[PDB]
Ligand SMILES: O=C(O)CCC(=O)C(=O)O
């Protein structure tokens with residue numbers, strides 16, 4: 451009863467100096483704290499939350515696109531079937547698109563009408579640095595490990611944009627607005643700040659229980675990884691799964707630790723901003739690679755290209771944690787062997803490989819057909835200036851085989867071997 455309703459790890463920062471303490475990093479990344487709420491963070495850091503107010507956003511970019519989710523308004527601990535007799539797991543929302551100005555008007559008018567179907571403004575893109583300069587500069591006041599960009603954040607070594615992960619997303623909400631259950635892409639940590647003026651209610655389960663939650667989704671007819679679902683709490687309690695529940699008030703920052711399963715509902719009218727962080731720790735990296743592998747089994751795109759990222763961190767960051775070092779070193783070796791096996795079988799087949807190289811800000815490539823990361827050896831076809839990249843398997847599966855397929859190598863064996871050899875444990 452007490453164990454199934456654990457208290458939520460909470461922190462108040464008395465000053466700006468408290469927020470920059472290494473103890474804060476330690477507490478938030480601790481595998482025992484699946485979720486942390488930092489009360490009054492905006493205040494303690496003198497963050498100008500007014501820069502993300504609905505009025506300021508409309509002024510900044512009122513015609514900016516907003517993905518709208520249309521939903522039935524219901525209590526945060528309920529999700530009813532269509533007949534209204536039964537709780538169900540699937541949480542269905544109509545997708546559509548509007549502008550910030552239009553959602554703003556609905557948000558403002560909704561609020562006055564107070565002084566049942568709703569609309570939730572979701573995944574609003576704040577990536578354009580010029581369009582959102584004062585907003586993004588404000589987030590430089592955060593301690594390094596929570597910033598959008600940082601040397602200790604894996605997402606800062608991708609070398610290019612991953613929308614919604616290493617760029618900020620905005621959510622504009624009215625009461626009842628729901629974000630259904632998920633783990634973050636590749637189990638990365640998440641940062642969320644409530645601009646407010648209202649509250650959000652959060653629900654969270656520790657990473658350890660994710661397979662049981664996955665089994666419920668399958669039992670209840672919805673895809674765990676990609677589907678839209680809202681847990682029935684009695685089902686979780688009956689399975690002895692502790693559920694963290696709390697309110698995030700305006701100015702509160704929520705830190706969602708690696709792999710934490712979470713879902714959220716607005717209690718009032720508010721805006722939230724969010725992004726991902728990948729702290730360079732053994733715990734984060736292991737969870738990120740586990741999901742990377744599981745994603746492949748389930749044919750779900752890994753939005754973080756973990757092989758590309760591992761090479762990049764290997765080239766530029768000094769790793770002192772020996773557990774993390776061993777994990778990365780292994781991944782790198784496995785990557786070199788995979789590339790070697792491909793080159794050898796292509797040479798035995800009599801197929802030429804052109805050296806292409808890498809250019810600045812180049813994306814990581816994925817297979818057109820199956821969405822796996824395609825690292826280094828690229829199987830390229832010409833669709834109709836339209837080049838498509840394929841993995842080895844999908845290329846071989848073509849009816850004419852590798853005829854008409856151009857094979858490109860982005861890193862020579864020696865480039866990889868030399869980066870690998872220079873990757874050593876820092877003291
Ligand atoms: O505020 C929201 O609805 C998004 C919550 C979330 O999933 C996150 O910040 O990771």
Ligand SMILES: [Fe+3]
Pocket residue numbers: 632633634640706712
């Ligand atoms: Fe999330």
Ligand SMILES: [Zn+2]
Pocket residue numbers: 817818819820821822840841842843844845
């Ligand atoms: Zn493929």
